[PDB]
Amino acid sequence: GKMAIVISTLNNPWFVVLAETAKQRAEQLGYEATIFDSQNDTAKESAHFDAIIAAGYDAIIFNPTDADGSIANVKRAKEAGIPVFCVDRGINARGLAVAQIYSDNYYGGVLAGEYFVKFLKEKYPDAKEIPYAELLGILSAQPTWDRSNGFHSVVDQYPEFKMVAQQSAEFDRDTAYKVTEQILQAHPEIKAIWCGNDAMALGAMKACEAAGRTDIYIFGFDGAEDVINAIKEGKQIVATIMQFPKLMARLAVEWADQYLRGERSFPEIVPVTVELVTRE
């Protein structure tokens, strides 16, 4: 059998790992697999779907370019009797894809908020107020808000923690440096910074270092090598959340295999868990 891997782009290592891992796993499970690159263009994606259908692929492993724009493509595959398993990104429709597998950003935010409170209440057990800042990801991106909302679902229950600044740094390291530099001038009372990803945590740390604010504790998300090393080295970044993209890609392929072997009972919306990383 053959599986088509339709990836949103290959211009970012995150997506390359997803596509290549899926192809590898399909081959391990005895299938042929081919990667199709949509190049962040829903029209290119649509053309790939039509080619894939015409060529009679047995399953599609899909990373959509747009949660709305990609719906019609999955519907055409469904009408052609080709099962679709989404990975990393989803579509805003049910009953079309067999399953939509994604990293549990909301739960990661919950884990991060829990540790934020644990760590900071250990450092500051008596403080009436623990002011902090939040760096958001890209405002239009679902992961931005799943992470932030998860964090706040925990931290907002502890009124002593006071968010005195909240701003996007675009999931970007250099932007986070600039934004953090400004936040430190405007809100020097902060004791901590919660960051929607590791790139932004690294930028925040460099801004803190430049300001001599080595006392401020920083919390991130992704499990990037540089942040894991910073945490392990006892730097002021003290936590992150590890994601498992290879497990996500492999799960989509494994479920596709299971489906072709006759299984039909799959949940449609499928979070793949994440894990807290700390000094200790």
Residue numbers in the entry: 2 to 281
What text does the study give?
Solute binding induces a conformational change to form a closed state in which the ligand is bound at the domain interface and buried by the surrounding protein. We have characterized the stability, determined the ligand-binding properties, and solved the X-ray crystal structures of the apo and ligand-bound forms of a thermophilic periplasmic ribose-binding protein from the hyperthermophile Thermotoga maritima (tmRBP), the mesophilic homolog, ecRBP, of which has been studied in detail.
The apo-protein was crystallized using a construct that consisted of residues 30–310 (numbering according to NCBI NP 228766), containing a M142A mutation to prevent expression of the in-frame ORF. The construct used to crystallize the apo-form of tmRBP was a C-terminally truncated form of the protein (13 amino acids). The apo-protein and ribose-complex diffract to 1.4 Å and 2.15 Å resolution and were refined to Rcryst/Rfree values of 18.0/20.3 and 19.3/22.3 respectively. The apo-form of tmRBP was solved by separately searching with the amino- and carboxy-terminal domains of the ribose-bound form of tmRBP. However, the relative inter-domain angles differ significantly (43° for ecRBP; 28° and 20° for the two molecules in the tmRBP unit). This movement is limited to one of the two strands (residues 101–106) which connect the two domains.
